[PDB]
Paper text:
The lectin pathway of complement is activated by complexes comprising a recognition component (mannose-binding lectin, serum ficolins, collectin-LK or collectin-K1) and a serine protease (MASP-1 or MASP-2). MASP-1 activates MASP-2, and MASP-2 cleaves C4 and C4b-bound C2. MASPs are homodimers that circulate as zymogens bound to the collagenous domains of MBL. Each MASP comprises two N-terminal CUB (C1r/C1s, Uegf, and bone morphogenetic protein-1) domains separated by an epidermal growth factor (EGF)-like domain followed by two short complement regulator (SCR) domains and a C-terminal serine protease (SP) domain.
Because there was no structure of rat MASP-1 3D, and the existing structure of rat MASP-2 3D lacked two of the three Ca2+, including those Ca2+ that form part of the binding site for MBL, both rat MASP-1 3D and MASP-2 3D were crystallized in the presence of 2 mM calcium and diffraction data were collected. This resulted in one MASP-1 structure at 3.7 Å resolution and three independent MASP-2 structures at 2.6–2.7 Å resolution. For MASP-1 3D, 276 of its 281 residues could be built into the electron density map. All four crystal structures revealed a dimer of MASP-1 3D or MASP-2 3D, formed by antiparallel neighboring contacts between pairs of CUB1-EGF domains about the crystallographic symmetry axis. The total buried surface area for MASP-1 at the dimer interface was 880 Å2 per molecule (1,760 Å2 in total), whereas the three crystal structures for MASP-2 gave 1,200, 1,090, and 950 Å2 per molecule. All four new crystal structures revealed well-ordered, similar calcium-binding sites in each of the CUB1 and CUB2 domains. In the MASP-1 CUB1 domain, Ca2+ formed contacts with six oxygen atoms in the side chains of Glu49, Asp57, Asp102, Ser104, and Asn105 (distances between 2.3 and 2.4 Å). In the MASP-1 CUB2 domain, Ca2+ now formed contacts with five oxygen atoms in the structurally equivalent side chains of Glu216, Asp226, Asp263, and Ser265. The EGF domains of MASP-1 and MASP-2 also bound calcium. Interestingly, the prediction of 4.26 S from the MASP-1 3D crystal structure was similar to the observed value of 4.53 ± 0.08, while that of 4.18 S from the MASP-2 crystal structure was close to the observed value of 4.09 ± 0.07 S.
Author numbering:
A (entry chain A), B (entry chain A): 2 to 277
Write the structure that this text describes.
Amino acid sequence: HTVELNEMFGQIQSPGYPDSYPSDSEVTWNITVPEFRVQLYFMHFNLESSYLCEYDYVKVETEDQVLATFCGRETTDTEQTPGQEVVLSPGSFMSVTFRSDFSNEERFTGFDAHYMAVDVDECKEREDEELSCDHYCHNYIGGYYCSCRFGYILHTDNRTCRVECSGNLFTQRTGTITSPDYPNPYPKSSECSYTIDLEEGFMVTLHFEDIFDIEDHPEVPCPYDYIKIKAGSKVWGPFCGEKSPEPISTQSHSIQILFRSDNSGENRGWRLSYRA
Amino acid sequence: HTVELNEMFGQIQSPGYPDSYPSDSEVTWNITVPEFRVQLYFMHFNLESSYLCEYDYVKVETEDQVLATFCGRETTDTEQTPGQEVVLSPGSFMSVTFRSDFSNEERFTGFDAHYMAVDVDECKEREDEELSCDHYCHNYIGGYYCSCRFGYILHTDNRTCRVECSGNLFTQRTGTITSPDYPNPYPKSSECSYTIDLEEGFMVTLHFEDIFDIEDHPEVPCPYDYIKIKAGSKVWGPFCGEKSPEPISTQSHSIQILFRSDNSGENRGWRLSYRA
Ligand SMILES: *[C@@H]1O[C@H](CO)[C@@H](O)[C@H](O)[C@H]1NC(C)=O
Ligand SMILES: *[C@@H]1O[C@H](CO)[C@@H](O)[C@H](O)[C@H]1NC(C)=O
Ligand SMILES: *[C@@H]1O[C@H](CO)[C@@H](O)[C@H](O)[C@H]1NC(C)=O
Ligand SMILES: *[C@@H]1O[C@H](CO)[C@@H](O)[C@H](O)[C@H]1NC(C)=O
Ligand SMILES: [Ca+2]
Ligand SMILES: [Ca+2]
Ligand SMILES: [Ca+2]
Ligand SMILES: [Ca+2]
Ligand SMILES: [Ca+2]
Ligand SMILES: [Ca+2]
Ligand code: NA
Ligand code: NA
């Protein structure tokens, strides 16, 4: 017999329970909960004892993995009997398999068990350091969601937290510009625009101070994050890595700057200055 | 503004949040979950400080009870500010009340909070020693249910555990009869029938030995549990209390016995004997 249901919980007995389970009986149960993990325990366990539970037995098994097997009598110690132990499936699926091989010598009362559903905690994260909340984790029953620190705006991915850097321009002859939340790690999934223009008769110079930190690779030139600068009709970039690019001078009075940062990385960002 | 919704959880901000909450603002929120208790915490708290939070404030209040009040700034210590503390409603209802009295001197950013639902555990029972599981408690998410020990049958009340004593008769001249699971407390909500008949020429005698324990009152004669015996056309009973009734003889060969036990009480029951 193959029986399948869900609810939030359930009750499962051996055939003929509380009385002795019939000979050569083979039964299976598929158990699923949508957002949760399956928890199961045994209120009563009495079965035929054998070597590695070959004859009579109960088997807790997931899709790709077998969780456990149980047989024998709960009264006898040093057994493989489940007793008061509680089996919990990693995934949202659990399958139970009861088998009576051929015949019982002495009649065994069988087993009585009860399952239920348990909320997966994504703040404890279960499986850890996978795709998960950037800043703030919030776990409700049957799922979770994320939020951001004051000043940070939640990105469309519902996971990472971005900021708005596009609202700034620099008028003065001299000054110093940084990355958002410098020296601290720059906000993920963000595009920053820094524009500097001057009245004619002024040539503009640029220098990189302090620490320079951007996620990079010995491979192709800055696939993840980068900085690129536009002066007149000519551009300079992309720039990344630990080593800061050498100081650069620009004839034109008009300069635009782009700093793009991806969804990943803890990289701390940069700082530079400008004078005419 | 009066806003009400449920889901499993939610997010609540002050008016105009993250920016300063407008002057003379008064808002209320009704929050309900069907089977659960309402849990609430604050991710951000910034409000106008005052005496006992008279001016600007947030108020967590149930139907018949006020849970807490909060005001001031989270940055300042020795405050009444909620901070990292978590408010939990005893019942399934929670109401939030935000008020800005008249006007802000300095603009306060307001507050950001998140609620959710939490399973009521009936095995820990919350409020304890109320109507609850006789033998075995099982708590799932959003409710519970009960079961019984091996040999006990669950009564229609879904709570108490009964037994079937009606399937026994006593043929022999001499013998001793007891209550179910004697000396241990008799099963609740049960009706037991013990029948004894003999061939003619025999008169039957009765005596009460050992302990005699039945739930009773100095008031009216055994409203809760009792024993009553039927011999011929005459009856004897009801009998209860600690003191056992005196030995009784019966002319007739036919005797029927009834022992009725209610939903309550731990009383241990009785034992007696019969000889002809
Ligand atoms: C029950 O689970 C088994 C495990 O492999 C699967 O083969 C079978 O199709 C499932 N049946 C139902 C009705 O889900
Ligand atoms: C993000 O959350 C919103 C909720 O408003 C939902 O509509 C959207 O489908 C979600 N997208 C992703 C990629 O999770
Ligand atoms: C909200 O709760 C208050 C508390 O007394 C009650 O008076 C009001 O009727 C409730 N409104 C709704 C829509 O539930
Ligand atoms: C007891 O549980 C059964 C479930 O089969 C339900 O139908 C019935 O209404 C319940 N009665 C009480 C008094 O709880
Ligand atoms: Ca067998
Ligand atoms: Ca969850
Ligand atoms: Ca990065
Ligand atoms: Ca005010
Ligand atoms: Ca519950
Ligand atoms: Ca009683
Ligand atoms: Na930075
Ligand atoms: Na008893």
